[PDB]
Design a protein around this ligand. Structure first.
Ligand code: 0L6
Ligand code: MG
Ligand code: MG
Ligand code: MG
Ligand code: MG
Length: 539
DNA sequence: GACCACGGCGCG
DNA sequence: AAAGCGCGCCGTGGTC
């Protein structure tokens, strides 16, 4: 391209280079723009940002987040990554997309700007005639990138002092556990090494190996294996407790306080828009979509996520979302009827599981039943089912047969979905988001059947994902108008932050927006809570 | 120092 | 572990 002075004209595509991948932490090393056979390189990148009306190009959101960080209201616009991701969700990296659609991802901003321009041209062309994918781009993905930029730049408050204190307490208990484990082993070793632990359990102590690891075929020391060995030796329960504590300390308690941003005083994640096979978002650096909640210590950690002083967190979560979606997709009368009657399948399974009346089911019981309900739906084996329920194999098989015999059109929907995936080479969500599954025609059964589980899951998980994205796009401007903030998405959950005076109004509004986003054959129900911290807001 | 595969496990 | 699906991050073991 012909080199030309900064600034570029309107509609130009940007290229940019960051010192590190995370936009909230990155130095803007270079900035350029391309349009009409010209490339414009900015002598001073930060100041040059002010000249742009929008960030149009590869990874547009990252530049937008950096702009917002610097106090500049620069929205992201067209991004070839989003076009490519819709065409084929295995398109996840600029490296791959460039290679596939007409160029090379290099480390020079001008080259990135020029690449953005031509990739957009090519990809836009491939989306001609693809009316449904075009709709998803214009109505969902492109607007959502703006919403996500604001969420990333906003961050969430964390009680750092609390976590520091908690680390010390957890360290002392970890020391107790490891010392006990070493005593029981008769000698110290690296308890963080599963290789060393395997030898202790299975070679030194008398314990029977139960399972093998996937890639290298070592004797597994996974939680499932240790659970089954709980009564065989006192060391097992001690290892399980050590694992829980060290996992939580090493992954959350210790790293998170170190990641508070010096300017904002908050914790900032990345919401990756082109990262999953189904259309879900992912979260990284740090991942805020896997903050603990199941165990007592996990709950103590989740409580560290707090509202700003004078504000409250609002948490909203779609009820039984994939089951409702499945009802719509399959058109099963029985399942549709369940939701029209305001029933709860998770609670019902739980009452059966623990052998108590439906009223006796506590949240932890219901949560246990969730894994069982979705596990069975998406192809869990009776053996695993019997194992995790500690019921005879015969009981497990019986639960699975009744699970499906109750809802006839579900299996039919599955069969049709798989048959159609074999024919077209892809499956699709309600809105037409696609996932290619070539292994549906694999000649190897285990490979083929794994592919089948991936394939029929995708329309369900993906439709739920599409619905949440659409809801975020609708909700965001309403929140802006109310002075509320959208902070996090966790798949079928949103966490907002609202001024205390407006918190109740915001909760009601958000619930209605989420429930009314795109009506299905069954009602969408959203549960909502309000609190000073993430845990309190979910109760 | 960074990268990697792996086993493992946190969430949905 | 086992025929649930979808992710990202941990330490280890290892390489470069
Ligand atoms: N390890 C976490 C324990 C609880 C769980 C779970 C899920 C599992 N195991 N598998 C899924 O596919 N899940 C998919 C299907 C769900 O519909 C969706 C949202 O998860 P959720 O909000 O926890 O469950 P829910 O929306 O079905 O139920 P509710 O509690 O929100 O009413 O995510 C969730
Ligand atoms: Mg839910
Ligand atoms: Mg949820
Ligand atoms: Mg892995
Ligand atoms: Mg290893």
């Amino acid at each position: 391209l012909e080199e030309a002075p900064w600034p570029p004209p309107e509609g130009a595509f940007v290229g940019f280079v960051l010192s590190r991948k995370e936009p909230m932490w990155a130095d803007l090393l270079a900035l350029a723009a391309a349009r009409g056979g010209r490339v414009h390189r900015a002598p001073e990148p930060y100041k040059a940002l002010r000249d742009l009306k929008e960030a149009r190009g590869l990874l547009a959101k990252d530049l937008s987040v950096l702009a917002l960080r610097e106090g500049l209201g620069l929205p992201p616009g067209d991004d070839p990554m989003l076009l490519a991701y819709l065409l084929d969700p295995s398109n996840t990296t600029p490296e791959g997309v460039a290679r596939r659609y007409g160029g090379e991802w290099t480390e020079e901003a001008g080259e990135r700007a020029a690449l953005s321009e031509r990739l957009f041209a090519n990809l836009w062309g491939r989306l001609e005639g693809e009316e449904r994918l075009l709709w998803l781009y214009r109505e969902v993905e492109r607007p959502l990138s703006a919403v996500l930029a604001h969420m990333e730049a906003t961050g969430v408050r964390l009680d750092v002092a609390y976590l520091r204190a908690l680390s010390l307490e957890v360290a002392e208990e970890i020391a107790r556990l490891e010392a006990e484990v070493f005593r029981l082993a008769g000698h110290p070793f690296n308890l963080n090494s599963r290789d060393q632990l395997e030898r202790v359990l299975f070679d030194e102590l008398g314990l029977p190996a139960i399972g093998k690891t996937e890639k290298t075929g070592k004797r597994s020391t996974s939680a499932a294996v240790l659970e089954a060995l709980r009564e065989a030796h006192p060391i097992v329960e001690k290892i399980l407790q050590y694992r829980e504590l060290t996992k939580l300390k090493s992954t959350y308690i210790d790293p998170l306080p170190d990641l508070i941003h010096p300017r904002t005083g908050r914790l900032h994640t990345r919401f990756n828009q082109t990262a999953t096979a189904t259309g879900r978002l992912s979260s990284s650096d740090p991942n805020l979509q896997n903050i603990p909640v199941r165990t007592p210590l996990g709950q103590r950690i989740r409580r560290a996520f707090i509202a700003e002083e004078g504000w409250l967190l609002v948490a909203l979560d779609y009820s039984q979302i994939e089951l409702r979606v499945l009802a719509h997709l399959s058109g099963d009368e029985n399942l549709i009827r369940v939701f029209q009657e305001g029933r709860d399948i998770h609670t019902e399974t739980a009452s059966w599981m623990f052998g108590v009346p439906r009223e006796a089911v506590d949240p932890l019981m219901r949560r246990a039943a969730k894994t069982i309900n979705f596990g069975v739906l998406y192809g869990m084996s009776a053996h695993r089912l019997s194992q995790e329920l500690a019921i005879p194999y015969e009981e497990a098989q019986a639960f699975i047969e009744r699970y499906f015999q109750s809802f006839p059109k579900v299996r039919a929907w599955i069969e049709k979905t798989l048959e159609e995936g074999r024919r077209r080479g892809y499956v699709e969500t309600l809105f037409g988001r696609r996932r290619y599954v070539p292994d549906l025609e694999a000649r190897v059964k285990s490979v083929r059947e794994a592919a089948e589980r991936m394939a029929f899951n995708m329309p369900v998980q993906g439709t739920a994902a599409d619905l949440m994205k659409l809801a975020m796009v609708k909700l965001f401007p309403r929140l802006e108008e109310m002075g509320a903030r959208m902070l996090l998405q966790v798949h079928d959950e949103l966490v907002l932050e609202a001024p205390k005076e407006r918190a109740e109004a915001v909760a009601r509004l958000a619930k209605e927006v989420m429930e009314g986003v795109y009506p299905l054959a069954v009602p969408l129900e959203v549960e909502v809570g309000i609190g000073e911290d993430w845990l309190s807001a979910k109760e």
